[PDB]
Design a protein around this ligand. Structure first.
Ligand code: ZN
Ligand code: ZN
Lengths: 243, 153
């Protein structure tokens, strides 16, 4: 079981039993080689073959809220936020465009893990992930060129979404002999053939969301905490209240 | 080698940035067009170390600084390789221009492919300010739209 990678998650742990509960919360999660608690900087370093989502969710269902801050050797991990590039008749009027996330981690000289999550698709069903030639999302999936690699495990979206009472979600933990260096810069696409393409006022055939595969900070590689902003005006705030 | 980043963001600012570079040694040519910006003004324009936005600005890290230096202007010698200074905007809030850089590269160990491009809501003080702050971000304030640099053509 070489497919292990190290990840660091920030979780508050400055209470009497905080750590013990985390230790407890993950005790049954198969696939975890080790946990390290740096109580000082309140960070949990985790060695495993598990999907980051698994770690983050197992903890959520236990009230503990963890925030991943790094994963893998530097330059061994990537992230791809999956968004739609047009609105569908089946989407909701006031929705944003995010639909899923592909968190990539290299675990072998030639083998990377893919923690694919989809939360909130309007049409239940089996979606298909694949990596496309280009990381150009200027014209949606069209501007991404031909397929670079097609995954086979489907992404079953039938579970109920915490977002909407009738939205769906899914997840799938794939693995491919694709090194991270050939992945970054390209695009990750998840799409399904629409059940009724007839109802979309456009030549649209598939319901798809994608994103360019970006570089993610490796374990202990990024310590940015906050960031620049301005404002917080009361006179500005009033004008907004009386528009 | 060609790259491109599409700038989006819930701020009404949006646009596209293109990169061209024949060989690692030769300079990269940056081309850009961005609407939604304030009219007749200057806006910061940096390349962050990561493209990961799973946590916004934070997950993106600081300005891509492979050579461990301080914040500066594209002109200055001492600068983060991701310091593209300020882009000017016409009377319609549209910034349109191009330039060449010798530090920014689409090839080799310092490739910016996969990292993100951002445009701020304020003017970049190019590190010519007082504060330590100035030598870090340059005080360009908030960042209304960004994007990941991806391979293309
Ligand atoms: Zn404390
Ligand atoms: Zn800088």
């Amino acid at each position: 079981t070489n497919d292990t990678y190290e990840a660091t998650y920030a979780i508050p742990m400055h209470c009497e039993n905080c750590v013990n509960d985390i230790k407890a919360c993950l005790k049954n999660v198969p696939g975890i080689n080790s946990l390290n608690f740096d109580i000082e900087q309140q960070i949990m370093s985790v060695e495993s073959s598990v999907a980051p989502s698994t770690i983050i969710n197992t903890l959520r269902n236990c009230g503990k809220d963890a925030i991943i801050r790094g994963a893998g050797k530097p330059n061994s991990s990537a992230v791809a936020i999956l968004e739609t590039f047009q609105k569908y008749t089946i989407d909701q009027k006031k929705d944003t465009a995010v639909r899923g996330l592909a968190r990539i981690v290299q675990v072998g000289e030639n083998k990377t893990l893919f923690d694919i999550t989809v939360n909130g698709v309007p049409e239940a069903g089996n979606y298909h992930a694949s990596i496309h030639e280009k990381g150009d999302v200027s014209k949606g999936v069209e501007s991404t060129g031909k397929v670079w690699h097609k995954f086979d495990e489907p992404i079953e979206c039938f579970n109920e979404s915490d977002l909407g009472k009738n939205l769906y979600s899914g997840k799938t933990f794939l693995s491919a002999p694709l090194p991270t260096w050939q992945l970054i810069g390209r695009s990750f696409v998840i799409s399904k053939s629409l059940n009724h393409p007839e109802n979309e006022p456009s030549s649209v055939k598939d319901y798809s969301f994608l994103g360019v595969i970006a570089r993610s900070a490796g374990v202990w590689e990024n310590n940015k905490q906050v960031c620049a902003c301005t404002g917080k005006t009361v006179w500005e705030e009033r004008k907004d209240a009386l528009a | 080698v060609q790259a491109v980043a599409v700038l989006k963001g819930d701020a009404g600012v949006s646009g596209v940035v293109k990169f061209e570079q024949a060989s690692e040694s030769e300079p990269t040519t940056v081309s850009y067009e961005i609407a939604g910006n304030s009219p007749n003004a200057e806006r910061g324009f940096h390349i962050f170390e990561f493209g990961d936005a799973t946590n916004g600005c934070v997950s993106a890290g600081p300005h891509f600084n492979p050579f461990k230096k301080t914040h500066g202007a594209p002109t200055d010698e001492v600068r983060h390789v991701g310091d593209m200074g300020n882009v000017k905007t016409d009377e319609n809030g549209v910034a349109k221009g191009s330039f060449k850089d010798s530090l920014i590269k689409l090839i080799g160990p310092t490739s910016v492919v996969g990292r993100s491009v951002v445009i701020h809501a304020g003017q970049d003080d190019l590190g010519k300010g007082d504060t330590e702050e100035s030598l870090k971000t340059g005080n360009a304030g908030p960042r209304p739209a960004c994007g990941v640099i991806g391979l293309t053509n």
